[PDB]
Swiss-Prot record, chain A:
It comes from Saccharomyces cerevisiae (strain ATCC 204508 / S288c) (Baker's yeast). It comes from the Eukaryota. Component of the large ribosomal subunit (LSU). Mature yeast ribosomes consist of a small (40S) and a large (60S) subunit. The 40S small subunit contains 1 molecule of ribosomal RNA (18S rRNA) and 33 different proteins (encoded by 57 genes). The large 60S subunit contains 3 rRNA molecules (25S, 5.8S and 5S rRNA) and 46 different proteins (encoded by 81 genes). uL4 is associated with the polypeptide exit tunnel. uL4 interacts with its chaperone ACL4 and the nuclear import receptor KAP104. Belongs to the universal ribosomal protein uL4 family. There are 2 genes for uL4 in yeast. It is found in: Cytoplasm; Nucleus. This is Large ribosomal subunit protein uL4A. N-terminally acetylated by acetyltransferase NatA. The eukaryote-specific C-terminal extension harbors a nuclear import signal and delivers the ACL4-uL4/RPL4 complex to the pre-ribosome, triggering uL4 release from ACL4 and incorporation into the 60S ribosomal subunit. The chain holds residues 312 to 362 of 362 of the full protein.
Swiss-Prot record, chain C:
It comes from the Eukaryota. Component of the ribosome, a large ribonucleoprotein complex responsible for the synthesis of proteins in the cell. The small ribosomal subunit (SSU) binds messenger RNAs (mRNAs) and translates the encoded message by selecting cognate aminoacyl-transfer RNA (tRNA) molecules. The large subunit (LSU) contains the ribosomal catalytic site termed the peptidyl transferase center (PTC), which catalyzes the formation of peptide bonds, thereby polymerizing the amino acids delivered by tRNAs into a polypeptide chain. Present with 54300 molecules/cell in log phase SD medium. It comes from Saccharomyces cerevisiae (strain ATCC 204508 / S288c) (Baker's yeast). Belongs to the eukaryotic ribosomal protein eL20 family. One of its GO terms (molecular function) is structural constituent of ribosome. It holds the Pfam family Ribosomal_L18A. Keywords: Cytoplasm, Isopeptide bond, Phosphoprotein, Ribonucleoprotein, Ribosomal protein, Ubl conjugation. HAMAP family: Ribosomal_eL20 (MF_00273). The keyword Ion transport does not apply. This is Large ribosomal subunit protein eL20A.
UniProtKB/Swiss-Prot annotation, chain D:
The gene is RPL18A. This is Large ribosomal subunit protein eL18A. Component of the large ribosomal subunit (LSU). Mature yeast ribosomes consist of a small (40S) and a large (60S) subunit. The 40S small subunit contains 1 molecule of ribosomal RNA (18S rRNA) and 33 different proteins (encoded by 57 genes). The large 60S subunit contains 3 rRNA molecules (25S, 5.8S and 5S rRNA) and 46 different proteins (encoded by 81 genes). eL18 interacts with NAP1. The modification N6,N6,N6-trimethyllysine is found at residue 49. Its main location: cytoplasm. It comes from Saccharomyces cerevisiae (strain ATCC 204508 / S288c).
From Swiss-Prot, chain E:
It is found in: Cytoplasm. This is Large ribosomal subunit protein eL21A. Belongs to the eukaryotic ribosomal protein eL21 family. Component of the large ribosomal subunit (LSU). Mature yeast ribosomes consist of a small (40S) and a large (60S) subunit. The 40S small subunit contains 1 molecule of ribosomal RNA (18S rRNA) and 33 different proteins (encoded by 57 genes). The large 60S subunit contains 3 rRNA molecules (25S, 5.8S and 5S rRNA) and 46 different proteins (encoded by 81 genes). One of its GO terms (molecular function) is structural constituent of ribosome. There is a cross-link at residue 1 (Glycyl lysine isopeptide (Lys-Gly) (interchain with G-Cter in ubiquitin)). One of its GO terms (biological process) is cytoplasmic translation. Keywords: Cytoplasm, Isopeptide bond, Ribonucleoprotein, Ribosomal protein, Ubl conjugation.
Length: 51, 183, 171, 147, 114, 48
RNA sequence: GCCCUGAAAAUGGAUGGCGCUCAAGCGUGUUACCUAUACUCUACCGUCAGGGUUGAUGCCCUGACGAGUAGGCAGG
RNA sequence: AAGCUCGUAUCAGUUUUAUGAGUGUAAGAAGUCCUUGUUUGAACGUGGACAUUUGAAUGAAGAGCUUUUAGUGGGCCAUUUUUGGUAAGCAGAACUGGCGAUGCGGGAUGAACCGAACGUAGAGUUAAGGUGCCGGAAUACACGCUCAUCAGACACCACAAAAGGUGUUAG
RNA sequence: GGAAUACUGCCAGCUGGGACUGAGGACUGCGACGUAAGUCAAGGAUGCUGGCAUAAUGGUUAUAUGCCGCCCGUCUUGAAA
């Protein structure tokens, strides 16, 4: 009889997607990435700074 | 994709990402004084009223349609969050020629279960990755009836190209902000 | 809008027996990447015989100012569309950034020459290393040693409709 | 406004209701509407659709035509169903023993059928005997032969 | 160069009726010196049939169905081969797809500024 | 008209057996008929 | 580029008016704001369509639509 | 408006592909395969078979065939092609839009201008146009230009010779 | 050499104020929190309290104020003209 938005209604969100509980519990919306130490090449830097 | 660009830069090369396979198109002009061929293309893309939106698979056959209806639509490349919010809030299914809201996974399982789609998340997956049943899933989705943007269009005059300070044409990644404002 | 500077590197699509086409790089002043790529394809079609459908964009990268908090003098070589043809123009702008100088130049072209963004072509923006190479007086008058000037007739903004004292323009 | 691709408020039609004021005909319409809704029988659908037709679209069916239909192999013991009037024919001299269900029988047709030894029944008796129209043969009279 | 009734031809001049340049139609009449051609022309919201009489040198054979016949033969051959050797085959044409990702190396091809 | 590259076929010629004939040939025949009529009228004027 | 001259009659009157001069003028840029019978959500009316139903040309459920002269059909 | 059928049926003011012209045609049951009869080859055939991976994209629940009649038929305006031009206006063809039959917002006001087409209401957001006061909304912010002894706030056509000026600014 | 910040984008992160609406009328469905019986914001509003109990709200009527509103029918493209 009435349409309820899952983005606002938590019960409807859980009804439509059981994985939302796991997503919220594991905080997958703010997951940290693994740090890498890759450096750009000298040719790339020279091309970027070239006029 | 992030690491592929970093490795290419470290190796002195350039990583070119694959071209977009999906666009989202919203009709921005009304139904008065439309030339016949663009009117026919709008009807073929199911944009029969202002602030109506649809997903289009990007091929050579559809890029020419988008080129034909360029002065009357705003289209771009939707993100996963934009697609998810559109399907969650304004997602409706065409069942027996009726517009039915997608309030349960049983509806989607009953109508698109023969294509392996069992839930709204499966429908979103089939939309975001243009799969073998993209045509059936997209035609099952009723054309999205968006509102006017909540913060305005951001320009004084809408009917110029987005490049020239207007609103129509391909705005690429800014369709996400526009559609989230209109949703 | 607030201009940004990009480098856009593109090429032709690789064909049979002609692999690794030559890469071409341009520096474009634009508000966003869509406008930057549009200007790049426009200039590439104007100079070479390469079309957008026949080529591709290899890279687009925003270039930031090296020392954004240092006052600099810029010589700007530009040309504008006219019926007789392209006419050169040289301007000198004192600013802290190339994008700020470009925005100032576009505002000046709109105010004086009644010119538009798609009509103005930016050829070169060059920082003037030595002050002796500055050759416009409206820039040279600010290079004087120990320059001080006042601001006579100060007008203060009022937030109320009525005031209970006669205003003063002292400073 | 929207740019309509189809006509708005378009009636399907399909002859929903009969135009007659006959109470018994309306009772038959009600009975076969129930049967067509609750049996999924194409025979019931056809009989219900034929109950709505007009007089010019329900031509009479002759007893000689019924006999010619019954002469087919395998149809010698089927019940002949005519949604309309069954008329007599003096051009045929031999009539088989058969059961005929029709809206109306003329006096000569009923006399000929009874003399042959069968029976004439109505559509409600037909519905009671065969609710799914088992072993039935629907006959329609010629249309274009009149002008 | 023999023309028969039912062939598809193109009207190509080697001044009047300049509208029928590049028009494609069906031959209905063949004589010793002239050829009759059927042309369907849009008039209002309907196509009207028109008879055109042309010289021999102003028409030529059309290749409008050549690709279709070749594709029919190729599809028949591929279907027979895939029936003889059981595997999934694709027979329908497809539009051009967007290109995939690639890595462009600046080995000898250092980008140049213009 | 004989050298004209393309001639539209008249709607009045339809329904007759003379449709398959070249309109250029038909017009040449009509011109020859008119010339012979003029010659016959000249001969008649000479006789009278 | 802007400014002045670059021709004007005849009752008293017009950037719509007041008036405006680092404009409330001209060119351009960035935002905020105002409000259509347009768009979005909801209720109600009617129409059409699709289903269900042993006062049944009635009842229940669902969806979408609604400009109009001549003229046509229907219910009052 | 009536009937008979069909209903993955019939399609499309569109794109794609192939092939012409400098926009036309075509894209499968109105098929294809084996087998060698018809007047060593074109063109017509004897019998059998492969289907829901049946022949590009997108959209579409109504389509096809027969009967059956109310009102109307020489209007204006605009855009895009082509031909002839005139003091200057323009004239003759092809095609497509708007209007008459149509209200609503804006352009002060309005037959063709800009938005947008209409059940009765509530709330929100906008279009075009605007935010000194009349008048709902910044005497907002920022860079420049201009002073006219009736500036300008305009239709981008004409006066207009890109003419005249010891006005001003930038090249 | 090591940080920070801007900008852009994401969160099935949290939380405060304001407005309009409350259709439906036993139950059935999809779910959530719980070992559990049970509970719940999950197939559309309930709970507590006050004043009045009549011209108070409301309707009608005469007028005032803000804004809008050209005289109908006919005939002619088109009519205030
Ligand atoms: Mg707001
Ligand atoms: Mg605006
Ligand atoms: Mg004003
Ligand atoms: Mg301004
Ligand atoms: Mg409506
Ligand atoms: Mg005000
Ligand atoms: Mg004058
Ligand atoms: Mg009151
Ligand atoms: Mg008024």
């Amino acid at each position: 009889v009435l349409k309820k938005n899952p983005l606002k209604n938590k019960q409807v969100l859980l009804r439509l997607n059981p994985y939302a509980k796991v997503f919220a519990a594991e905080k997958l919306g703010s997951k940290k990435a693994e740090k890498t130490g890759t450096k750009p090449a000298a040719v790339f830097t020279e091309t970027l700074k070239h006029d | 994709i992030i690491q592929a660009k970093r490795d290419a830069k470290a190796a002195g090369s350039y990583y070119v990402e694959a071209q977009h396979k999906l666009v989202f198109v919203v009709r921005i002009k009304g139904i008065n004084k439309i030339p016949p061929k663009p009117r026919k293309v709008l009807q073929l893309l199911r944009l029969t009223r202002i602030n109506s939106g649809t997903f289009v698979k990007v091929t050579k056959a559809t890029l020419e349609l988008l080129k034909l209806i360029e002065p009357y639509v705003a289209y771009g490349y939707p993100s996963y969050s934009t697609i998810r919010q559109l399907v969650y809030k304004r997602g409706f299914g065409k069942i027996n020629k009726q517009r039915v809201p997608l309030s349960d996974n049983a509806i989607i399982e009953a109508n698109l279960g023969k294509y392996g789609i069992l839930s709204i998340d499966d429908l979103i997956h089939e939309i975001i990755t243009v799969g073998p049943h993209f045509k059936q899933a997209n035609n099952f989705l009723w054309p999205f009836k968006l509102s006017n943007p909540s913060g305005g269009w951001g320009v004084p005059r809408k009917f110029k190209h987005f490049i020239q300070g207007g609103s129509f044409g391909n705005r690429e990644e800014f369709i996400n902000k526009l559609v989230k404002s209109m949703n | 809008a607030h201009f940004k500077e990009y480098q856009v590197i593109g090429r032709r699509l690789p064909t049979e027996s002609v692999p690794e086409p030559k890469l071409f790089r341009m520096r474009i002043f634009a508000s966003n990447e869509v406008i930057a790529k549009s200007r790049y394809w426009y200039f590439l079609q104007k100079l070479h015989k390469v079309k957008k459908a026949s080529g591709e964009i290899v890279s687009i990268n925003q270039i930031n100012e090296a020392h954004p908090t240092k006052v600099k003098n810029f010589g700007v070589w530009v040309r504008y569309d006219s019926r007789s043809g392209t006419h050169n123009m040289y301007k000198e702008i004192r600013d802290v950034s190339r994008v700020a100088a470009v925005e100032t130049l576009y505002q000046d072209m709109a105010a004086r020459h009644r010119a538009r963004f798609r009509s103005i072509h930016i050829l070169k923006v060059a920082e003037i290393e030595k002050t002796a190479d500055v050759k416009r007086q409206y820039v040279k008058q600010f290079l004087t040693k120990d320059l001080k000037f006042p601001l006579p007739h100060r007008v203060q903004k009022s937030t109320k409709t009525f005031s209970y004292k006669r205003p003063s323009t002292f400073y | 406004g929207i740019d309509h691709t189809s006509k708005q408020h378009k009636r399907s039609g399909h002859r929903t209701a009969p135009k007659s004021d006959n109470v018994y005909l309306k009772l038959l319409v009600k009975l076969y509407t129930f049967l067509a809704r609750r049996t999924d029988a194409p025979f019931n659908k056809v009989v219900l659709k034929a109950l709505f037709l007009s007089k010019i679209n329900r031509p009479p069916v002759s007893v000689s035509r019924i006999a010619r239909a019954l002469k087919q192999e395998g149809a010698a013991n089927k019940t002949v169903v005519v949604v309309g009037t069954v008329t007599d024919d003096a051009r045929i001299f031999e009539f088989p023993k058969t059961t005929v269900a029709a809206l109306r029988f003329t006096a000569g047709a009923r006399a000929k059928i009874v003399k042959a030894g069968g029976e004439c029944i109505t559509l409600d008796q037909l519905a009671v005997r065969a609710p799914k129209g088992q072993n039935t043969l629907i006959l329609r009279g010629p249309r274009n032969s009149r002008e | 160069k023999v023309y028969k009734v039912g062939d598809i031809v193109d009207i190509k001049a080697n001044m009047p009726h300049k509208f029928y340049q590049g028009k494609t139609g069906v031959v209905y009449n063949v004589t010793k010196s002239s050829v009759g051609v059927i042309i369907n022309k849009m008039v209002g919201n309907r196509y009207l049939e028109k008879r055109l009489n042309l010289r021999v040198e102003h028409i030529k054979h059309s290749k409008c169905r050549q690709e279709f016949l070749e594709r029919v033969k190729a599809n028949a051959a591929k279907r027979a081969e895939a029936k003889a050797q059981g595997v999934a085959v694709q027979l329908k044409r497809q539009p051009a797809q967007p290109r995939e990702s690639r890595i462009v190396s600046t080995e000898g091809n250092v980008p140049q500024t213009l | 008209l004989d050298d004209q590259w393309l001639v539209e076929v008249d709607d009045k010629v339809k329904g007759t057996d003379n449709e398959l004939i070249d309109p250029r040939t038909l017009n040449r025949a009509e011109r020859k008929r008119l010339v012979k009529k003029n010659e016959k009228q000249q001969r008649r004027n000479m006789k009278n």
